[PDB]
Amino acid sequence: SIEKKEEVIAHNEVVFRSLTQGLYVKEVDIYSDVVSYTKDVDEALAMPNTINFKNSRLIMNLDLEPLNKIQKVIYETHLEGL
Amino acid sequence: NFADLGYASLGEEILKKDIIDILVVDNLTKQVIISYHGCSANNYNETWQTNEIVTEEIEFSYLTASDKART
Amino acid sequence: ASEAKQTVHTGNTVLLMIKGKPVGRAQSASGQREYGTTGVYEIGSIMPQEHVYLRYEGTITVERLRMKKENFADLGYASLGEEILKKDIIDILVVDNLTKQVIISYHGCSANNYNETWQTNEIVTEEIEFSYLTASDKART
Amino acid sequence: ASEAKQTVHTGNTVLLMIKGKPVGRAQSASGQREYGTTGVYEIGSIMPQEHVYLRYEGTITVERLRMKKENFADLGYASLGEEILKKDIIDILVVDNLTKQVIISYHGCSANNYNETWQTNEIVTEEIEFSYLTASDKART
Amino acid sequence: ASEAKQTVHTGNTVLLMIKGKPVGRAQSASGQREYGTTGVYEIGSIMPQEHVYLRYEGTITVERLRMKKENFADLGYASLGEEILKKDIIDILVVDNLTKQVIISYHGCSANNYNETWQTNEIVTEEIEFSYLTASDKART
Amino acid sequence: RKKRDNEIQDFPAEDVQVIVEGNEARISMTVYPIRSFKKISVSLVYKQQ
Amino acid sequence: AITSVDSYLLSEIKPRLNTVLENCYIIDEVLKDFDYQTRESFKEAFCGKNAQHEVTVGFNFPKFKNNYEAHYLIQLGQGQETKNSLGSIQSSYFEATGDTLVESSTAIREDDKLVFTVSKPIGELIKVEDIEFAKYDNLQVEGNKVSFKYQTNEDYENYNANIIFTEKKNDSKGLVKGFTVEEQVTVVGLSFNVDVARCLDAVLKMILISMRDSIEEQQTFQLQNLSFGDIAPIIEDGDSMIFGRPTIIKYTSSLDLDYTITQDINKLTFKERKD
Amino acid sequence: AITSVDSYLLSEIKPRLNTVLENCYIIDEVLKDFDYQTRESFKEAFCGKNAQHEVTVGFNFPKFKNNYEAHYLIQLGQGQETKNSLGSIQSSYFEATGDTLVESSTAIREDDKLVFTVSKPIGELIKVEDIEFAKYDNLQVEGNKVSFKYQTNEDYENYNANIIFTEKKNDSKGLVKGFTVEEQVTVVGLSFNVDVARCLDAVLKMILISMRDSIEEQQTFQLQNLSFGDIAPIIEDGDSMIFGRPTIIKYTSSLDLDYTITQDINKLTFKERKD
After folding, report:
1. D110 → closest Cβ in C10, C37, C140
2. Which residues of A touch G158 (CB under 8 A)?
3. Cβ burial C28-51 (10 Å sphere, 16+ → b, else e)
4. What DSSP line would sit under B15-66, residue for residue?
5. Are C11 and H87 within 8 A, CB to CB?
């Protein structure tokens, strides 16, 4: 069974994915337009998913699917009877 | 202070101040070394300064000075 | 392992910052403060009855290696003549390398003397001594 | 074997304590006292007929390595500006590590000057010098 | 590789020049400046309300090995007697070996004292200390 | 500095708040307004001697 | 907390070294000074996720064979005592505290507060990244979470932050006894090709610099002093020599112990003399 | 930017040494002190473009044979750390900058300006030879070219100049972390004839002096300290001995790394307390 458990959210961020290729954004230009793409989900360019950031600049490009990303890390212990 | 304690005065209240007697005393045994009788004030001086301690000075004129009760 | 309860500051955990700019190749700095304590002695006592604070004097020194760029003269922080009269006050901050939290800040710093040494066998060094209005250790945790 | 009749104090048998708190990573401390002795010279003698005590001045210095926490500024014992005026007196105690008995205590300590050194190749150090009203060696066995 | 963003000055990247002539076998030079800062203390404050500049004093020293020719006495820059009264001011320039750009120049230099040492086991050395009107770091890039 | 110039009479030092978020920072602080002198009430008593 | 410097070197080196060799851009910056031939040959061999050859690291006198093509070798070296303290005292603590940690967390929406949760009890907080909590925020700690009030902070329900905190174990207050130790440790790269050794040493110097920013280094292992020996043939009895440039690393650290106090005074009674 | 001193020595020595031996006038100045017999015999052998014999240079422990008639041998030597800085910080830069270059260019006639073109982006300018651009000239940089206005400079449409400039890579501002290293390197000449060795050593001393004016030396490798050993038989197990006078070169340089900053503040909002 479970003796002790806790869930903590390490990160909440927004990630950018191309609609045509499906490759995620790796690097961008001076005005955050893409210069490189990568298949990696996690290495993809990401930014905090907070309202203030949105007002501080999704905005820039059209071949753009702004996706939200969340990370869950869970600490748990078990006592497995015999 | 002298102004607070009434031993000295600033305004016209001086005319209501009587004579004062001063004693200089041996600290060990409270024996008397010299006494001034009938002290009355002549001059009163005061100073204030940026970083010094406030200094209060006063001048007394007396009628007589006696050194007795030592023996 | 790293128990923070016993840690101390060293040259590798400190930054010297002016106007946000980290001064480069800075070697040492010393700070002095004088409260000018003086005692009060009565007639009937050799012992000082009490002590009192009278005057606050404080200076800070900085030693640096003259970089070819961004030296104290080029930065405009120091001065070499009548240009000094147009130089306003500055604040010199000592900030933690790890957290970027502040350790101590000097407010209203003003320059006192300027020293530079040209030597043949060693790297060029310059020293500045400032006089400040007040010190502060606020903005902590 | 350990014959107490010849033992001496060292850095490993002493503690420096303030308000019950043992100050950490303290390095050295020095104490000075001046009785201001002066002689009395008559006309018919080059020799001093007698000496007399006139004035008691005493200071104590403390050297410390600035811990990231509980430094003299953070503890409130020292001060960096007008905050000093609200700092009351303190008593600095030197107490035996073995027995926790007192060796010497300074009463009515007040701060005189404050020094701190930031250096690149060495651990940070700070020095404080206090002026005290009286010293005491009471509370012995 | 050579990243200029971190370079510093040393004895091998500096030249000491007078009237266009590079002084030979020059060993060291030190520069001092004093703005004479003083604080203003009100009655109702131990703290200095502000600092003000009052007086500009500056000196520069030069150490040299006495060449058999073109020593400071032979060059006419120094003096040994009443000949000094006919010596006009000079400008001492510290110029970069690489670019020949100027690093700092002293204007209206005047001689203060003259020292020479004759020794048995070491090369002869002489030292001069000048007092200058103003310093300048103009003519940069 | 303002207090040293008498522009402000008093303020709380510990009340300041600072938050940073990417390219933006939020600053919050409080300062006590100056108070002027408005009302005076007086009464007199006449007596003999 | 006796510090095993040798273990710390291995713990830091193994992950960081793999990351550095993983990408090519960083290596170019590291090897900017070296000539084209040596730079690319090393890159062709070890650099990149697709590198067939790999570097290894281990301690001295192993009973097996090491990859003498390229290997990092460590040996403990000398140690010395440099500075003491009165009563050997270092610090006093009201709480039994372990290591200092850095953790990332996202704010959670409670009623009166926004709270971050951490993997372990908070004990002593040190910093939350770029937040200066005012008194009206009423920052406080509770168990494994830290809380600050909600009002005039309502835009931050999704705030993503890093937290620096300490591991709490017990409420048993105690003192610290110990002193400072000046320790030296030796590190050397090995190869049968001198060019590889020089590149290998230069890579090492960079990660030593990066270690200056580490939490453990900043808090526990301070005052680096590096010293390099001359390139020498480590071995001559073989088909070809082994060449390596030894390096010496110096550290300053504390050998500390925890002394617990049970004499907690709670009561205080005043009685006057009978006379 | 870890500095490989050994590579720098080879890069500087190989071209400059060939140039010195190419002409005879410079050699006479170098060998002014030596006697006639040794001076001319060396000149007959190596000096001149038509020299049949030639000098070589290489590193230690090579698997091939070197020209033991005359050869320069280098070995890395010791290294030490001498001076640090607070936070190990050296400098701060707003632009990612590479090496510092010297290039020659001729002015070009534009409409409003005269411009010089350079092989790479200019980044930071340091100096154009013997020009003190006034404010009315309005000196400015653009890409790989530097421009100054035309008026009251019209005689200089054909101006031929040298330019000192830096290689720009990125706009990513960052800090420098590092320290100073005091390094020693060994150099020795080899021959089976002692007279050749003495001449060879003296030639070396001159080019070391000339290296004091080099861009790399002035900017990166400073504070020369030279030390010469006694002439010794390097080898005795052969038909004849090998004689060589070792020399030791000391340098001061920085082991630097680039740390990039992304926390650029652009917005700044003030909100008053609700109370």
Report:
1. C37
2. 12, 48-51
3. bbebbbbbebbbebeeeeeebeeb
4. GG---EEEEEE-TTT--EEEEEEEEEEEEEEEE--SSSPPEEEEEEE-SEEE
5. yes
